[PDB]
C-alpha cells in the first residue's frame, strides 16, 4: 500500500513474495594475535626460567620419596606427617605426585577411575558388616572415603531402585518436573489421568540464538615451532586430553570405537554425551509449521483438512 | 493416619477470599472472615488478574501487624487456583550473591508469567511381547531389528529404526516389560513387567511389583499441559544444555540480549497459536525490605506488557525507606507509592476475632467450650491475635495430656501461664534487667 | 536449615547375588535356530561363597557385559538383583600366594549364601533430596565430570525444586 | 449462503506507555495539542523533537539529556515517544540506573556494555553454503592416522555434488551424528553444520523410528545468499570475549559453561572498531547509532556519574537519554554533597536539561481519556469529570490506575460502561499515597 | 552376517551364524595347588 | 558519505596541543585555543614523555569544570601520536569487582610503558602463475611479481598449506617462509577476467623484511599468566596477576634493555578525574611512581579542598599530601569572551555549521553566563532548528529558541524552587 | 639421552640436521630450524633454516639460583600446569591467587631444612 499480483501473492502465502531465509549468527573473524619470534623464543617464563622452575619440582615435599621418607620412615613411636591420609585413601605416593605434577589431565583419569572404583566400594562397605577388617582393628585402606555411606550416594542410589526416582534430575535429560498426564484411546474415545509423572519440558523451548559467533581468537606467531604448538592446540592438545573431553575418557573413547559391535552398549561419557534440542550449530532453518502459521488462508485451510479427514470426506 | 508434607501451617485454613458471584465479601467463608474492605478491594484485583487484559499493576496491602494482610495474599492465592502463576517473595529474598538485587527482581518477576504450552504426541503403550536385535558380524556395524507388542485386545510387529534401538537397548527392555514409547521422539518408558512370566524366567535380571497389561487400542495419543514461566524460558535459553541451572539456581545475570529476545518468540508463540501466555501475580511480601535501588528497579520493571500483576505487604508506619535516611509511608519511595493502588486492612471486633479462633479450631480438630472460646477472645484482644492463634495447639496438646475431650477455660489459663505473651515477657525482662545482656 | 529438619524414612529391599565365580559356562540349546550356527539360551554363573556354591542361571546378554569388565574364573563379582548389571570386584584372596606380586587388591571371599537380601529403611532429610537433585552424582556426563572436577559450591536452590521434590515425596 | 470468520487468541497486553506512539509534532517540529498519544508538555515535545532529528542526523556522539520533572509529568513517556518516533531500525537501549550494581562484573563497566549496546551496525553478510542428502562419506587417511580431508556426497532435487572438505567439518559430521540418507546444511564460513533427520525419501523404511524426516532441499549443493544481519557493536564485543564460533573442543563447551559477564579490555573495543571501520569501508556495512536511555539516572553511583564524563566524551558514543524525578537530593555514594536532580553538577554541565511539568485539570482530563480508549473501556463523561477531579485532589498514576478496577467493578455490576456509581466505590476501596498517608499518621502508635 | 538377540516371549537366545566366532567362550576353573 | 565509528565528540575538533617549536602556544591552532600558560605547560610535558628519560614523572591539570583540563589531555595524546603508549582512563575505571583496586593501578600503569623489538622475516609475495601436486606428496609452485619470475620445488609443509588454503593460479599471496602461512591478497589484474584485484607486487619474491614490534609491559606480564594467557588480553579474565611473576618479567625486560635486544618505550597513563581514587589507590600511586618501569603520569581534576575518598579528611584537589607532593600541577584558569567566541567558532567549524557574527556574539553571551559547555551543546541544537525551518545559517532566533527549549543547570535549578514540595527527596 | 629427553626431542618434532639446544641439568630442550646446510632440500619449505652454531657444543657455567620459600609455597600448593603449553585441559581453569594452607608451609620448611 506504501501492481496488483503483488496484493494476491501476499493474500495467498507471504513465502510467495519473500522466502523466509534460514537465518544463522554474524560469523566475525579478527586478525590472530600476533606474538613476536622475539617475546616467543625468551619472553615466555616458562622457558626462560625453566632451570629454576626445575628447583621448585625438586624442594616439592610431594616428591614420592618424601612421601615415602615423612610416612613410613618416622623416629617417633607416635609422630604427625602430612601425608598420613594416603593410607586411607586409596592414593599411592607417585598417584599423589603425577596428580600434582601433571595438571588437569591427570585430575581427569583418576576422577573417572574414582567413579569406577565407588561401586566396588559401595557393595563392600553395605554388605560386609560381620566380624571385622582383621582383629577388630587397624582402619584398612579406602576407610576415609566415608562419602559412599550417604544414603544418596550415587552407588547405593544406583544399588536401591527407589531413591533413584527421587533423584530425578540428572544431567542431560530435559526435566521440567513433574505433572499429570492424560491419555486418549482412539477406540470409544475415552481417556485417562496419569497422575504425577516426570515431564521433559517441550521439544522447541530452545530459540534463543547469539547475534554474533566469533572465532576462538588465536594467537599468530613468525618461528616454525610455534607454529607446531598452535597446531597441536588447534588439533586438540594430545590424544588423550582429547579423548577425555570428547567420549569423556580414553577408556571410553576405546570402547565408543567398538560400540559399534555390542548390542548393550553404556553411555557416551565426554561432550558426545550430549545432544542438545537443535545440535551444537545456530543456524535458524525455518520449521514446516511456518507454512500454516504465515498464512491466515493455509491456517484457515488447516483446520478444515483436519476437519474433513475426521470426517472422512474426500 | 499418614502425614503428608504440607502441614497445618500460619494460613492453612484460608481457601479464598470467600467473595459471591457478585464481588460482595460474606462475613465469613472459604476461611476467611470479617476484613470487609481489602476482601472485597482484592477480589477486584484477583479478578484484574485472572482477565489478565493489563500489565504492570501494583496492589499494596496495609495495616497494623496481625490484621490479614498475608491472609488476603496467600488467600487470593488459592481463590486464583494452582494452573496460573503466583510467586510469594519475601523482600529479603532478593539479597542474592549468585546475582544483583535487580536480577533477582527480574527472576521473581519473569517466574510470575506462566506460558502454558499444550504438548499432544502418538504415544504406543504395550506389553513387550518379543525383541529382535539383529548386529552384523564386523562391516559398517549398522543394527537392525523388530519388536512385537501387545494389549488385552491387540498385537502388532514393528520393524525397528536404528535411533529406536539404541534407545531400547540401552534402557535394557526385556520381553514381558510394559512400554510406553512417545512415537514422536524415540522415548521409551517403563511401567513395570506384565504378572504372566512368573514360570519362566533366569535367575533375576530384574525385580519390580508387576504391573497389569495395558488394556485396549495399541497406539494412543497423550496430553500435558506444560505451565513453563518466562524466568525458565529464559534459563533454557541461557547456555546449550542449561537445564538443571532450573533446579540448581546457578546461572545468575542472565543477558538482556536473551530477555528481549525470548520477549519477542514468547510473543509469537502466542500469535502462531503455539503457547497461551498467561499472566500472574508477584506477592513481595514485607516489601518494606527493598532497597531504594531495588524500588527504582521497581519504578521501570512494572512497566513493561511481560509484567505480571504484583502484591506488596507492609506493616510499617512512616519509617526511613532502606538503604537511605529518608522518611516515607510504608518504607516505600513516593516514585513506586504513586505508582500502585493501596488496600488498607483494618483491625477486628470482639466478633472476628472469636469468629477467626473458632475456624481455626476446626482446621485444627480441637473441640473448646464456648467458656474457652470466651476466654481465648479476651486474650486475643488483651494481647495480639497471633498470640490467641498459637494457644489453641498448646491448650489442646495439654488437653490430651490430661485425656480430656475438649478444652476448658482453665486449659486456656493454665497455657496463658506457660507461654508467654511477648508484652508480658517484655514485662518480666524489667525485672532481671541487670542479668540480660546488652539492653 | 529449615529443609534440614525434615526427614523422610524410606524403605526398600536390597538384593545381590555375589562370590566368586568358579565358572562361566555360556550354554548352548541342543540345535541352532533356521540359519544360525549355534544359540545360547543362557550363561551359566558358578558363585561361591563360605556358606556354598551355586550355579546361576542368566540371560545371554550378561557375556556381553562380563567381558566389558575383565571377569574371569576366580574373581569375586556381585549383580545388582533389581538391576541386572555385574560388577567385578578383584581376583579372591584364596589367589593371593599364586605370585611373589600382582597388581591387584585380593578381595576376601564372602560369607552369607551367594543370593543375600535384606529390607533396609533409609532416612533422608529433605535437604539431601534438594543437593542431590540440585547437583547430580552420576558421573558419566561431561557437565557431571566438569561439575565434580570444579570448587562445590552452595548454590540459590529455586522454589521450583522445593516444589517438585514436595510434589514426589507426596507421591 | 454461509458466511463463517475466525481469529483463536489472545491481544498483545495493554501496558503502562502503550498509548503513546510518537511525540506529535507538526512538520515544522510544534508541538500538536494532542497527537500520537501524548498531550500537554510542548516545550518538551519541541525539544525532543530537535532530539529525534539530533539521533538521526548520525553526526553527534556522546550528546545527552536529562528529562527533568515531578513524579508522573510523561519523562519516561517521552523518552518512549522518542523511542517511536526513531521507528525499529535505529536501537534504542532502556536501561534502569541500579541496574549498573551488578555482582559478575564492575559499576563502571556495566554503563559500557549498555552503550556499546546503543550503537546499531546492519551487515550485509555473505553466507556459502553446501546442502543436501548426505549420499556418500568418507575421510582420507594421512601419517601421524589422522584424517586429511572428507568426501561427502551431497543431493537436492537441483542435482548432486561429491566435495572435497576440511577435517574440522568431518569431525563436527561425527558431533552431529551424520549418516548417509540424512539432510544437512553446512556453511563454509561457520565450518557449522546442522542435521535436519532422513530425507522423506526414507520415512517409509521403518515401521518404528526416532526421526523427523524432511523434503530434499532445492537449488544446486553449493550456494551463496546475503543475510542482512542487524548487530550492536557489544554483540560484537562479548561475542569474541567468551567465543562461542568456531567448532574445537574449546568452543563448545564456552556454550555449556556458566554465561559469566566479564570486564572487556578496552584493546578489544579498539580491534573492534578498527574491524567494524574496514566493513563500512567496504561499503559491506552501514551505522545507525542509536539511543541509550538511563531511566532513573539519580542513583547511578557517583562511581558512574564519574565515569559518564570519559563515556559522553567518546568520540565513538551514542546519543543519551537520562530521566530523574528528584529535588535536591544527597548524591549516592558521597553521603555529604546535595545537587539538583541528584546528579552532580560537574557532569550537570555535559547535558542538554529539557524541563518536564504538572498537569493543569484539562490536560489530566485529556490523559484519562487517551488512556481509558487505550485500556478498551467506555467511560460517561460524568465519571470521567469525576476521575478529573479525583487528578486535581491526588495524582495523575492514581487517577489513571482506577480505570481498569472500575471496568472490572462495571462489567460486575452488570453495566457496560463506567458510571460515576462505580469510580466512587473504587476511590473509597483504594487508597492512594496522599489519603494512606493521613491514616497512617493518625495510627502511627501501632505500625 | 547377522549375530542375532533375540528376547523372547518364553525366555532370551543369543544368536551366531555359521563362521562367525561366537565368542563368548567357556570359562572354567583349572585346579589350584594345596597348602601355601 | 558514510559515518565512521569515530564520530564529532567533545574533544573530537582537537588534533593536537598546538606549539610553535620553542614550545610557545600560538593563539589557536591544531583545533585548540587560549589556555597560553596551560599549554607550554602540557608541551614540556609532552617533551619529557617523547624523550623518555625520567620514570614516574607525573602531572596535575588542574582547574574549574570546563576550562580544558581533558582538552588539552586530549590535544597531548592526539600530538603524542602513535608509537608511544597512551592509556585514557577514568578514576572510577580502576574500581573491579574482579580485581584488586591496587593490582587495576599497576596494571593500567604496565598497559602504558611499551616494549619494542625488531626482526628480520623472510616474506615471499607475488601472483601465483601455475601451481602443480602429485603423490608421500611431490609439486611445484610458481610465483610472478612485476619484474621476475620463479620456479620453486615444495617441501611437505608447504603442500599442505597450499592446497589446504585453496591457492589459484591468478592469486597474489604473501608467505611467511618460516611458518608457511598464506595470507592471499585477491587476483592480479591481469587474471580480474572470468574477490578484490590488485596489480601484482613489485621487486624481488623473496624480501627479509624488518619488521618491527611493539608490546606492553602488562601484555607480557598476562601472556606469561595462563596456557593461551594472550586471551586474558581481550577477554578481560586477567585477575591478580601475580607479583613474582612481574617481578621476573620486569628482571628479564631489564637485560633485554641492557643487551641491547629490546628497548622500552614509555608513555603515558592518563587519570582523569583522580579525585575518586580511594586513599588506598594514592597510597599505591605514591610507591609506584618510584620505579624505572613507571610511565609518564598526567591526572585531571576540578575540586578544591575536599574529602577524600574513604576518609574524613580534607585536602586539596581531593588528593592527599603525600601524592600532590610527588608531582607537578599545572593549572587552567577560565576563558575570556574572545576566547570563548574562538572555542564556539572551532566547534561551528568541526560541526560543518554556519552562523552570523551576531549569533556568535549572543552565543558567546550564553557561553559565559552559563560555562561554556552548554553553549557548545546549543551550536548543535540550534543547527538541526536552521534544517527543521529550511534556514542555511544558524540567526539569533534559532539560538533564543533552543535557549528556551533546554535549560542549563542554574535555570533549571530556578524553575525547581517553583515545584520545591512537588519533586521527591530534598 | 636418557628416554624422557628422547620424548621431548620427538615433542620438538626434532629430525636429522635440526639444530637443538639441549640443556643437561633442566632436561629443556628447543628446536631452533634446520642447519641451513639442508635449505637447498626443497626450493619453497615451510621452516626456518638457522646457520649452523659459531659456538662450542657444550657449555658450562656454574650458575648461582635465587628463589624464595613463597615460590614453593605458590609452586607446590595448586596442581602445576604440568605441560609445556602443550595440552588444553589447561584452557578451563583459569588460575586464581588461595589461601594456602598453614599445614603445607609446614611441609615446605621440614623440606628445605632436609
Ligand atoms: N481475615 C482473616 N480471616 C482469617 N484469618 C485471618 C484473617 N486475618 C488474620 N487472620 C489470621 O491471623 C494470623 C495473622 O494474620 P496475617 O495476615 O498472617 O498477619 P499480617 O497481617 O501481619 O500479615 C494468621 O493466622 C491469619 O490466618
Ligand atoms: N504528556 C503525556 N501524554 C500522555 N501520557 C502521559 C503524558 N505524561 C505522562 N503520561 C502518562 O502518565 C503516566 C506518568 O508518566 P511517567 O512517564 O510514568 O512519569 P515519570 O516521568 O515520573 O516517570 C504514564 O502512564 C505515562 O505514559
Ligand atoms: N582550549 C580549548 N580549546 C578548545 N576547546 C576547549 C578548550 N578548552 C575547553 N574546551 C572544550 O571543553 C569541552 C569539554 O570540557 P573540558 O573543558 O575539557 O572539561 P574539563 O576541563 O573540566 O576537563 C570540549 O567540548 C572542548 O571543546
Not at chain 4, 549443493?221 to 554483540?235: F, G, N
Request: glycine residues 8%; contains cysteine; aromatic residues 6%.
Amino acid at each position: 500500500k506504501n501492481l496488483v499480483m503483488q496484493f494476491r501473492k501476499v493474500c495467498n502465502h507471504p513465502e510467495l513474495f519473500e522466502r523466509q531465509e534460514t537465518w544463522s549468527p554474524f560469523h566475525i573473524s579478527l586478525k590472530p594475535y600476533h606474538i613476536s619470534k622475539f617475546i616467543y623464543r625468551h619472553g615466555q617464563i616458562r622457558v626462560f626460567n625453566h632451570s629454576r622452575d626445575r628447583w621448585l619440582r625438586v624442594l616439592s615435599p610431594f616428591a614420592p620419596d618424601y612421601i615415602q621418607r615423612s610416612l613410613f620412615h618416622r623416629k617417633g613411636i607416635n609422630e604427625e606427617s602430612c601425608f598420613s591420609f594416603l593410607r586411607f585413601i586409596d592414593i599411592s605416593p607417585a598417584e599423589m605426585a603425577n596428580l600434582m605434577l601433571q595438571g588437569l589431565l591427570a585430575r581427569w583419569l583418576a576422577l573417572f577411575l574414582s567413579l569406577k572404583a565407588s561401586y566396588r566400594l559401595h557393595q563392600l562397605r553395605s554388605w560386609g558388616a560381620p566380624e571385622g577388617e582383621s582383629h577388630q582393628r587397624y582402619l584398612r585402606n579406602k576407610d576415609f572415603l566415608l562419602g559412599v555411606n550417604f544414603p544418596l550416594s550415587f552407588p547405593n542410589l544406583c544399588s536401591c531402585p527407589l531413591l533413584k526416582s527421587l533423584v530425578f534430575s540428572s544431567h542431560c535429560k530435559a526435566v521440567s518436573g513433574y505433572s499429570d498426564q492424560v491419555v486418549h484411546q482412539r477406540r470409544s474415545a475415552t481417556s485417562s489421568l496419569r497422575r504425577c509423572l516426570l515431564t521433559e519440558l517441550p521439544s522447541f523451548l530452545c530459540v534463543a540464538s547469539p547475534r554474533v559467533t566469533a572465532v576462538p581468537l588465536d594467537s599468530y606467531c613468525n618461528d616454525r615451532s610455534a607454529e607446531y604448538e598452535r597446531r597441536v592446540l588447534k588439533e586438540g592438545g594430545s590424544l588423550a586430553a582429547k579423548q577425555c573431553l570428547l567420549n569423556g575418557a580414553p577408556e571410553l573413547a576405546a570402547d565408543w570405537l567398538n560400540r559399534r559391535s555390542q548390542f548393550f552398549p553404556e553411555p557416551a561419557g565426554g561432550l558426545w554425551s550430549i545432544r542438545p534440542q537443535n545440535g551444537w550449530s545456530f543456524i535458524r532453518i525455518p520449521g514446516k509449521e511456518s507454512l500454516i502459521t504465515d498464512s491466515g488462508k493455509l491456517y484457515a485451510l488447516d483446520v478444515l483438512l483436519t476437519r474433513l479427514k475426521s470426517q472422512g470426506h474426500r | 493416619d499418614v502425614t503428608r508434607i504440607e502441614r497445618i501451617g500460619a494460613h492453612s485454613h484460608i481457601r479464598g477470599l470467600g467473595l459471591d458471584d457478585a464481588l460482595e465479601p460474606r462475613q465469613a467463608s472459604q476461611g476467611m472472615v470479617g476484613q470487609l474492605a481489602a476482601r472485597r478491594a482484592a477480589g477486584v484485583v484477583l479478578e484484574m488478574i485472572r482477565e489478565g487484559k493489563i500489565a504492570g499493576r501494583a496492589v499494596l496491602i496495609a495495616g497494623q501487624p496481625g490484621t490479614g494482610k498475608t491472609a488476603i495474599a496467600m488467600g487470593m492465592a488459592q481463590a486464583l487456583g494452582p494452573d496460573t502463576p503466583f510467586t510469594a517473595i519475601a523482600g529479603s529474598e532478593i539479597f542474592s550473591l549468585e546475582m544483583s538485587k535487580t536480577e533477582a527482581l527480574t527472576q521473581a518477576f519473569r517466574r510470575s508469567i506462566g506460558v502454558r504450552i499444550k504438548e499432544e504426541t502418538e504415544i504406543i503403550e504395550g506389553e513387550v511381547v518379543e525383541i529382535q536385535i539383529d548386529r552384523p558380524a564386523t562391516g559398517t556395524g549398522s543394527k537392525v531389528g523388530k519388536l512385537t507388542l501387545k494389549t488385552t485386545e491387540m498385537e502388532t510387529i514393528y520393524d525397528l529404526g536404528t535411533k529406536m534401538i539404541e534407545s531400547l537397548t540401552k534402557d535394557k527392555v526385556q520381553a514381558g516389560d510394559v512400554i510406553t514409547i512417545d512415537k514422536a521422539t524415540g522415548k521409551i518408558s517403563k511401567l513395570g513387567r506384565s504378572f504372566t512370566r512368573a514360570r519362566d524366567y533366569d535367575a533375576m535380571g530384574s525385580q519390580t511389583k508387576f504391573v497389569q497389561c495395558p488394556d485396549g487400542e495399541l497406539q494412543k495419543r497423550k496430553e500435558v499441559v506444560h505451565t513453563v514461566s518466562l524466568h525458565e524460558i529464559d534459563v533454557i535459553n541461557s547456555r546449550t544444555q542449561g537445564f538443571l541451572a532450573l533446579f540448581s539456581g546457578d546461572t545468575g545475570e542472565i543477558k538482556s540480549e536473551v530477555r528481549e529476545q525470548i520477549n519477542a518468540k514468547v510473543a509469537e508463540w502466542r500469535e502462531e497459536g503455539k503457547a497461551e501466555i498467561i499472566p500472574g501475580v508477584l506477592f513481595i511480601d514485607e516489601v518494606h525490605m527493598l532497597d531504594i535501588e531495588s524500588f527504582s528497579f521497581l519504578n521501570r520493571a512494572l512497566e513493561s506488557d511481560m509484567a505480571p500483576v504484583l502484591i506488596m505487604a507492609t506493616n510499617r508506619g512512616i519509617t526511613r525507606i532502606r538503604g537511605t535516611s529518608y522518611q516515607s509511608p510504608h518504607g516505600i519511595p513516593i516514585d513506586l507509592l504513586d505508582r500502585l493502588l493501596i488496600v488498607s486492612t483494618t483491625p477486628y471486633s470482639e466478633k472476628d476475632t472469636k469468629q477467626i479462633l473458632r475456624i481455626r479450631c476446626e482446621e485444627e480438630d480441637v473441640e473448646m467450650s464456648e467458656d474457652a472460646y470466651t476466654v481465648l477472645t479476651r486474650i486475643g484482644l488483651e494481647t495480639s491475635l497471633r498470640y490467641a492463634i498459637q494457644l489453641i495447639t498448646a491448650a489442646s496438646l495439654v488437653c490430651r495430656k490430661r485425656k480430656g475431650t475438649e478444652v476448658q477455660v482453665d486449659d486456656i489459663k493454665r497455657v496463658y501461664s506457660l507461654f508467654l505473651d511477648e508484652s508480658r515477657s517484655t514485662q518480666y525482662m524489667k525485672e532481671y534487667q541487670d542479668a540480660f545482656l546488652f539492653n | 536449615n529449615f529443609r534440614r529438619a525434615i526427614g523422610l524414612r524410606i524403605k526398600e529391599t536390597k538384593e545381590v547375588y555375589e562370590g566368586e565365580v568358579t565358572e562361566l559356562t555360556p550354554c548352548e540349546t541342543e540345535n541352532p535356530m533356521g540359519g544360525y550356527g549355534k544359540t545360547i539360551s543362557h550363561v551359566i554363573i558358578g558363585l561361591k561363597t563360605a556358606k556354598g556354591t551355586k550355579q546361576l542361571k542368566l540371560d545371554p546378554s550378561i557375556f556381553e557385559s562380563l567381558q566389558k569388565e575383565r571377569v574371569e574364573a576366580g574373581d569375586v563379582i556381585y549383580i545388582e538383583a533389581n538391576s541386572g548389571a555385574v560388577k567385578r570386584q578383584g581376583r579372591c584372596d584364596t589367589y593371593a600366594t599364586e605370585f611373589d606380586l600382582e597388581a591387584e587388591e585380593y578381595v576376601p571371599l564372602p560369607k552369607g549364601d551367594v543370593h543375600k537380601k535384606k529390607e533396609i529403611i533409609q532416612d533422608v532429610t529433605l535437604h539431601d533430596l534438594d543437593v542431590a537433585n540440585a547437583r547430580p552424582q552420576g558421573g558419566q556426563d561431561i557437565l557431571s565430570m566438569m561439575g565434580q572436577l570444579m570448587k562445590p559450591k552452595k548454590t540459590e536452590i529455586t522454589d521450583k525444586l522445593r516444589g517438585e521434590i514436595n510434589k514426589v515425596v507426596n507421591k | 449462503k454461509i458466511e463463517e470468520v475466525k481469529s483463536t487468541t489472545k491481544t498483545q497486553r495493554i501496558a503502562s506507555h502503550s498509548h503513546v506512539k510518537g511525540l506529535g509534532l507538526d512538520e515544522s517540529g510544534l508541538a500538536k495539542q494532542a497527537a500520537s498519544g501524548l498531550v500537554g508538555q510542548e516545550n518538551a515535545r519541541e525539544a525532543c523533537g530537535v532530539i529525534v532529528e539530533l539521533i538521526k542526523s548520525k553526526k553527534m556522539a556522546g550528546r545527552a539529556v536529562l528529562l527533568a520533572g515531578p513524579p508522573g509529568t510523561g519523562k519516561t513517556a517521552l523518552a518512549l515517544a522518542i523511542a517511536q518516533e526513531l521507528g525499529s531500525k535505529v536501537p534504542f537501549c532502556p536501561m534502569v540506573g541500579s541496574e549498573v550494581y551488578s555482582t559478575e562484573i564492575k559499576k563502571t563497566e556495566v554503563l559500557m556494555e549498555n552503550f556499546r549496546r546503543a550503537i546499531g551496525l546492519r551487515i550485509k553478510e555473505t553466507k556459502e553454503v553446501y546442502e543436501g542428502e548426505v549420499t556418500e562419506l568418507t575421510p582420507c587417511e594421512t601419517e601421524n592416522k589422522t584424517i586429511s580431508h572428507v568426501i561427502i556426497g551431497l543431493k537436492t532435487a537441483k542435482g548432486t555434488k561429491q566435495l572435497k572438505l576440511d577435517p574440522s567439518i568431518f569431525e563436527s559430521l561425527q558431533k552431529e551424528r551424520v549418516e548417509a540418507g540424512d539432510v544437512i546444511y553446512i556453511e563454509a564460513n561457520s565450518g557449522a553444520v546442522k542435521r535436519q533427520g532422513r530425507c522423506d525419501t526414507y520415512a517409509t523404511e521403518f515401521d518404528l523410528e526416532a526421526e523427523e524426516y524432511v523434503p530434499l532441499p532445492k537449488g544446486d549443493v553449493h550456494k551463496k545468499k546475503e543475510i542482512i544481519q542487524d548487530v550492536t557493536l557489544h554483540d560484537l564485543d562479548v561475542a569474541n570475549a567468551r567465543p562461542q564460533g568456531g567448532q574445537d573442543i574449546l568452543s563448545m563447551m564456552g556454550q555449556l559453561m556458566k554465561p559469566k559477564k566479564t570486564e572487556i579490555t578496552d584493546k578489544l573495543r579498539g580491534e573492534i572498531n578498527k574491524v567494524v571501520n574496514k566493513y563500512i569501508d567496504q561499503g559491506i556495512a552501514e551505522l545507525v547509532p542509536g539511543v541509550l536511555f538511563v531511566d532513573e539516572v539519580h542513583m547511578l553511583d557517583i562511581e558512574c556519574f564519574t565515569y559518564l564524563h570519559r563515556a559522553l566524551e567518546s568520540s565513538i558514543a551514542p546519543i543519551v537519554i537520562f530521566a530523574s524525578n528528584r529535588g535536591n537530593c544527597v548524591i549516592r555514594g558521597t553521603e555529604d554533597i546535595t545537587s539538583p536532580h541528584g546528579i552532580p553538577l560537574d557532569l550537570l554541565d555535559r547535558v542538554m536539561i529539557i524541563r518536564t511539568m504538572l498537569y493543569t485539570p484539562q490536560e489530566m482530563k485529556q490523559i484519562i481519556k487517551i488512556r481509558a480508549q487505550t485500556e478498551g473501556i467506555n467511560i460517561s463523561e460524568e465519571a470521567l469529570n469525576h476521575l478529573g477531579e479525583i487528578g486535581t485532589k491526588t495524582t495523575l498514576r492514581y487517577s489513571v490506575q482506577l480505570l481498569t478496577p472500575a471496568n472490572l467493578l462495571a462489567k460486575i455490576n452488570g453495566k457496560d460502561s463506567i458510571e460515576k456509581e462505580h469510580v466512587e466505590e473504587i476511590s473509597e476501596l483504594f487508597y492512594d499515597a496522599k489519603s494512606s498517608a493521613k491514616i497512617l499518621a493518625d495510627q502511627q502508635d501501632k505500625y | 552376517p547377522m549375530v542375532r538377540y533375540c528376547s523372547g516371549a518364553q525366555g532370551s537366545t543369543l544368536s551366531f551364524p555359521p563362521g562367525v566366532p561366537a565368542p563368548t567362550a567357556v570359562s572354567q576353573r583349572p585346579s589350584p595347588s594345596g597348602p601355601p
